[PDB]
């Protein structure tokens, strides 16, 4: 776990990327009333409103949901809110309550989640305070300035296993786990640019 | 609805003068005019009136004599009480809803109180019946659209031809006005489910006790379908119930489902009792899906409460130790499990919601209740997938369904709410109590055989009377405590002829020939056979139709002690044979046929026989598949041994399936064969008492057939 | 190019056609689409059986007597002489005026008839509806099994404009006309091309006014206007 975690940097990176998306979301929601979030309905008669999410343009288990006006919800202020796939398929069609964390940390607690008349997703507090929610749509200067110092760290530490990896009391077995290991990083950092 | 009370009379003339200017004002706009007597007048104007809606009667001489009787029946009936100058409530006629006019007695003013009161009763109207009656009534007198569905539009295609005219004027006008079709803007529509018909389904469920109910247009056989058709996917395991109805036999044959059928408990008289509970538990559900190949978990759990006769279960230990996500109760027989606190915990719409399971009936709606044919209810419970269960309602619905059917099957959930309703069930157990009552007293104080009633020896409670196990009234050999119940409306009568250890007598009477004996007054048996009798009593039997059936029971006694012939007695059979029937008498008859019961032996050869099951070869699917193709053949009755069947046999008596659709008779069963052997022997001798089997078809020399598979 | 003796006319049918396109299946200038004389029949209690483009239909079964045959002439004439003087839509719509007093205020019957036959014109309906009906879209699996995969829970939505290439789960049934488009179980490829098009047609001809929505057995109406059917997972 430490040669593939803080050996070339591999968890070192994932820290700092945290603070370039958080950096990154907090520029999104100031803009997010160009484009909403439509939610439309599954078909069937059904008892109860079902509602359904975006089709092939959403596709991750742990999207993230934007926010116009922010809330104080649990005694702190949250400027983007995570759903779990798998968990918000089974409360928009049988009911009940959903759990979700704040800020992307911490557990899944439980939000006062309902629908809204004009097909949106209104979050109530204490307050009874409205907040309709929006999705990060399909990359602004300074982001970008500062993703490229952090993906040109991962070249060059590639660059070092790539020069000493001709180590003869080196066994071959680790060398397949730690090519494995960079890869994932790389894999990650290249999705936020998109 | 046009009848007006004026009670009392207060003996002056400033009070009753107004009364008899009201007099000549109401008859104007067609009101009856009733004046009754003393205070318990007024009430037998109410239960045994429903067409009441005006009472009119002192303020200051009944305050607390009248609110409070009148509120215990009908809560939402007007009341045009006159006050005076010094007039006041009391602290006793708050928690009471009730509906008080006051009025003046001021003279010439007798015309605005007539118009008040044809007001009044409008709003009554407007609030007892539901939207979709209301929408209904409405557009009759005001909707006249034109180009319409169907073509007669109110009858306009019958006015053309002379043999139409004779069809328009038997119903009425209000009635071809009323068949519309979903051309509607401000009915909506049945499949749409919206408008007045979403408001409909939320009307039922919550007086049912009910998350949400269904309005099915084609009878409850169709209703029982549509559940087959969403808990059982092309490959599982149902759990359906050995006594089932002829439409669960056809759901079986769609499905490529492998169902398991239970063993429930049976008595010698016929008298079908219900599943142990040694067969919910864990260690017997998998038992029989690892005997049975190509049978996976079972998933969904057909269950008869109540059966044919009338015995509830226990839902409290069922949703309990019965691990099954949809368990089904056939509840086609007892409509009013909730409108009584002795049925608290007996149905599955009576408790809560329970967790990962959900509970599906089949309420019957046009069987014991008050509506046109062709109607019934589905209640679901539960948090499952409703849009997968209406896909196989619209496949069964047309498009245009019949409006006249829906606002009667609404109705019948609007005529049990409130305490005016409440009284139509326990109204009809009062007089089922005191009928049973009657039975036992015609019986120690007559002077001969009496008939007896399948009841406990103690009838003095008032609530479902459980079947213990310290008993010999019911005659179910090692029951369960505290699972079978007894429906206090359905009275069935014993005829003599049996023991009380299962054996037979010496002196007694078939049920057979009580039977047709009270269709000659106007009385139809439900069931019959053995030494059983069958009625129902629900709303639709009054008082008059109760002690009529006491009237024609001691009718019988009287004709068979006296010895009076057949043709004196049973016109009906006379005219079958009247060559054989000739020099035979009541006791003549009666005595021959019991000979015959002992000496083929019946109690023996019925109780063997449904117990058993047959080696179920294929699934019920498998064999329907078969007859699509063109290979269905037939044997002799001896020659069917080791042959898969074709047809569900339903052998009258009784009245329960006996060999399954895809099912082998070989050595295990062989008191199975016995049972079909016996009927054609008893039942040729004397004509009448011919035998009734659904499958056995009858030839010409007496020896009966049935469809079997080419090998 | 029609088979002889082969297709008859059905006298009792009277298919009413109204002035809006020419003898060679083109447009015309002046033009009254059907919808808006639908409309105005059921003012008077007409309820029209078939309406859409420039056609119309009635029932004359043998429950119409002279009255109601003779009645339906009466309201056609009244048509002509509330639309060559020139009337408003509330004088004459009042149903019409009560879904959107503030939309249709100031709007006459000469107004609104002639901006809604500039749009079937620019849109082209004739030429878009007459080539998505010859094609049939690639039928991969029977319409059976695609009821089995909405038994186990495999179904989901998607956007009209990105839907090429997936099997549909239930019947498009546009109106007008009153024909299957899409079978439940086909798939939408590059062959049926002008199928896909009569869908993202009446999207916009159907948005701008209020009264005449687009009306599909199976395109659900949202918010934003993107109308979505229901596919099948892969
Ligand atoms: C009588 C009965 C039926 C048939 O009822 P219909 O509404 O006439 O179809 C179905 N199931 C059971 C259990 C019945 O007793």
């Given at each position: 776990?430490?040669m593939?975690?803080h ?8 820290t700092?990327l ?6 990154h ?15 439309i309905?599954?078909?069937?008669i059904?008892?109860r409103r079902?509602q ?6 959403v596709?991750?288990?742990?999207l ?9 919800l649990?005694?702190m202020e ?5 759903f ?5 398929e ?13 800020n992307?940390?911490?557990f899944?607690?439980?939000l006062?989640?309902?629908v809204?008349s004009?097909?949106?997703?209104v979050?109530?507090?204490?307050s009874?305070?409205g907040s ?6 399909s ?11 952090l993906?040109?760290?991962w070249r ?5 296993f790539?020069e000493?990896?001709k180590?003869?009391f ?9 090519e494995?290991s960079?890869?994932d990083?790389?894999?990650?950092i ?5 | 609805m046009?009848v007006?009370?004026?009670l009392?009379?207060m003996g ?5 003068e107004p ?9 104007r706009l067609?009101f ?7 205070r318990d007048?007024?009430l037998?104007?109410?239960?045994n ?5 005006g009472?009119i009667?002192?303020?200051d ?16 009936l ?12 009391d602290?006793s ?6 509906q008080?006019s ?5 003279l ?5 109180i007539a ?13 007892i019946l539901?939207?979709?009656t209301?929408?209904?009534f409405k557009y009759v007198?005001?909707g006249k659209?034109?180009?319409?569905t169907?073509?007669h539009?109110g009858?306009?295609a019958?006015q ?15 009635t ?24 409909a ?6 007086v049912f ?7 099915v247009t084609?009878?409850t056989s169709?209703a029982n379908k549509?559940?087959?058709m969403?808990?059982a996917?092309?490959?599982?395991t ?10 669960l ?10 169902p ?17 509970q040694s067969?919910?538990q864990?260690?017997t559900?998998?038992?029989?899906v ?5 049978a996976?978990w079972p998933?969904?759990?057909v269950?008869?409460?109540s ?5 509830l ?5 069922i ?14 027989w ?5 409108f009584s606190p002795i049925?608290?915990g007996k ?13 599906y009936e089949?309420?019957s709606?046009?069987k014991?209740?008050?509506?046109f044919?062709?109607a019934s209810?589905?209640?679901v419970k539960?948090?499952?997938?409703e849009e ?12 245009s369904?019949?409006?006249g059917?829906?606002?009667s ?5 609007a ?9 139509l069930?326990?109204?009809?157990i009062?007089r ?5 009552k009657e039975?036992?007293?015609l ?9 007896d ?8 409670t008032?609530?479902?009377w459980?079947?213990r196990?310290?008993?010999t009234?019911h005659?179910?050999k ?8 007894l429906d ?15 054996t037979?007598?010496?002196?007694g009477?078939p049920?057979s ?6 269709d ?7 069931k019959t056979?053995?030494?059983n009798?069958?009625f129902?009593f ?6 008059t139709?109760?002690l009529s ?22 016109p009906?059979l006379?005219?079958?044979?009247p ?10 008859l ?14 023996d050869?019925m109780?063997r026989?449904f117990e058993?099951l ?8 498998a064999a329907?598949?078969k007859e ?5 053949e ?5 020659e069917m041994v080791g042959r ?6 339903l052998?009258?008596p009784?009245?329960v ?5 895809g ?6 069963s062989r008191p199975?064969?016995?049972?079909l ?7 040729a001798?004397?004509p009448?008492?011919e035998?009734?089997?659904h499958?056995?078809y ?5 020896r ?8």
């Amino acid at each position: 776990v430490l040669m593939t975690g803080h050996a070339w940097q591999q968890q070192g990176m994932l820290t700092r990327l945290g603070a370039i998306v958080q950096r990154h979301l907090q520029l999104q929601q100031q803009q997010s009333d160009k484009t909403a979030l439509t939610v439309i309905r599954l078909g069937g008669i059904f008892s109860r409103r079902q509602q359904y999410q975006l089709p092939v343009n959403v596709t991750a288990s742990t999207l993230t949901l934007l926010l116009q006006k922010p809330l104080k919800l649990h005694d702190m202020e949250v400027v983007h809110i995570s759903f779990e796939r798998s968990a918000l398929e089974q409360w928009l069609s049988k009911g009940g309550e959903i759990r979700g964390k704040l800020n992307g940390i911490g557990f899944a607690q439980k939000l006062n989640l309902e629908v809204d008349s004009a097909q949106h997703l209104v979050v109530r507090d204490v307050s009874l305070q409205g907040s309709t929610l929006a999705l990060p749509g399909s990359l602004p200067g300074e982001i970008k300035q500062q993703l490229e110092e952090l993906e040109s760290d991962w070249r060059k530490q590639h660059a070092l296993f790539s020069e000493q990896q001709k180590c003869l009391f080196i066994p071959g077995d680790w060398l397949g786990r730690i090519e494995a290991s960079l890869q994932d990083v790389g894999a990650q950092i290249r999705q936020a640019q998109q | 609805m046009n009848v007006i009370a004026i009670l009392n009379h207060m003996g002056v003339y400033f009070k009753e003068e107004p009364i008899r200017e009201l007099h000549r004002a109401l008859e104007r706009l067609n009101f009856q005019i009733v004046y009754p007597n003393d205070r318990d007048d007024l009430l037998k104007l109410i239960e045994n009136n429903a067409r009441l809606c005006g009472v009119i009667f002192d303020w200051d001489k009944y305050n607390l004599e009248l609110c409070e009787e009148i509120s215990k029946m009908n809560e939402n009936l007007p009341l045009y009480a006159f006050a005076n100058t010094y007039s006041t409530l009391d602290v006793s006629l708050n928690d009471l809803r009730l509906q008080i006019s006051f009025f003046e007695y001021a003279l010439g003013a007798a015309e605005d109180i007539a118009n008040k009161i044809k007001q009044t009763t409008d709003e009554y109207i407007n609030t007892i019946l539901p939207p979709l009656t209301k929408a209904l009534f409405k557009y009759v007198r005001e909707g006249k659209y034109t180009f319409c569905t169907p073509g007669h539009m109110g009858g306009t295609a019958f006015q053309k031809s002379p043999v139409g005219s004779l069809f328009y004027d038997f119903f009425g006008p209000n009635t071809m006005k009323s068949d519309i079709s979903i051309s509607v803007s401000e009915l909506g529509s049945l499949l749409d489910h919206s408008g007045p018909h979403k408001e409909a389904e939320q009307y039922i469920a919550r007086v049912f006790n009910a998350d949400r109910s269904y309005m099915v247009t084609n009878g409850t056989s169709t209703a029982n379908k549509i559940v087959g058709m969403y808990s059982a996917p092309a490959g599982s395991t149902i759990l359906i119930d050995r006594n089932c109805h002829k439409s669960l036999t056809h759901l079986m044959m769609m499905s490529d489902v492998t169902p398991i059928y239970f063993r429930p408990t049976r008595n010698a008289y016929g008298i079908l009792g219900g599943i142990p509970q040694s067969e919910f538990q864990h260690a017997t559900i998998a038992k029989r899906v690892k005997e049975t190949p190509n049978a996976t978990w079972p998933v969904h759990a057909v269950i008869t409460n109540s059966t044919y006769d009338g015995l509830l279960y226990n839902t409290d230990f069922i949703k309990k130790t019965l691990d099954v996500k949809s368990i089904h109760f056939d509840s086609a027989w007892v409509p009013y499990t909730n409108f009584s606190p002795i049925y608290e915990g007996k149905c599955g719409m009576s408790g809560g919601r329970v967790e990962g399971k959900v509970i599906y009936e089949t309420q019957s709606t046009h069987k014991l209740l008050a509506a046109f044919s062709q109607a019934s209810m589905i209640h679901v419970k539960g948090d499952v997938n409703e849009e997968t269960f209406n896909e196989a309602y619209m496949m069964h619905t047309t498009t245009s369904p019949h409006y006249g059917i829906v606002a009667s099957t609404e109705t019948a959930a609007a005529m049990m709410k409130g305490n005016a309703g409440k009284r139509l069930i326990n109204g009809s157990i009062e007089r089922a109590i005191k009928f049973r009552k009657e039975i036992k007293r015609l019986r120690t104080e007559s002077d001969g055989w009496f008939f007896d009633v399948w009841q406990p020896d103690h009838i003095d409670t008032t609530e479902c009377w459980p079947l213990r196990s310290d008993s010999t009234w019911h005659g179910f050999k090692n029951i369960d405590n505290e699972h079978m119940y007894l429906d206090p409306i359905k009275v069935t009568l014993l005829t003599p002829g049996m023991e009380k250890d299962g054996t037979m007598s010496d002196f007694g009477i078939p049920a057979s020939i009580v039977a047709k004996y009270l269709d000659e007054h106007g009385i139809v048996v439900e069931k019959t056979g053995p030494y059983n009798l069958l009625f129902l009593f629900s709303i639709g039997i009054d008082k008059t139709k109760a002690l009529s059936l006491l009237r024609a029971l001691t009718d019988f006694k009287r004709a068979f002690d006296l010895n009076l012939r057949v043709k004196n007695m049973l016109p009906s059979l006379y005219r079958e044979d009247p060559e054989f029937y000739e020099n035979m008498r009541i006791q003549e008859l009666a005595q021959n046929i019991h000979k015959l019961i002992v000496h083929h032996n019946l109690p023996d050869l019925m109780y063997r026989a449904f117990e058993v099951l047959p080696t179920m070869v294929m699934t019920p699917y498998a064999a329907f598949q078969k007859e699509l193709h063109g290979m269905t053949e037939e044997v002799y009755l001896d020659e069917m041994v080791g042959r898969i069947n074709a047809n569900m046999i339903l052998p009258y008596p009784p009245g329960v399936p006996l060999v399954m659709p895809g099912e082998m008779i070989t050595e295990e069963s062989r008191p199975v064969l016995e049972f079909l052997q016996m009927l054609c022997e008893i039942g040729a001798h004397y004509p009448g008492f011919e035998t009734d089997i659904h499958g056995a078809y009858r030839q010409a020399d007496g020896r009966y057939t049935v469809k079997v598979l080419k090998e």
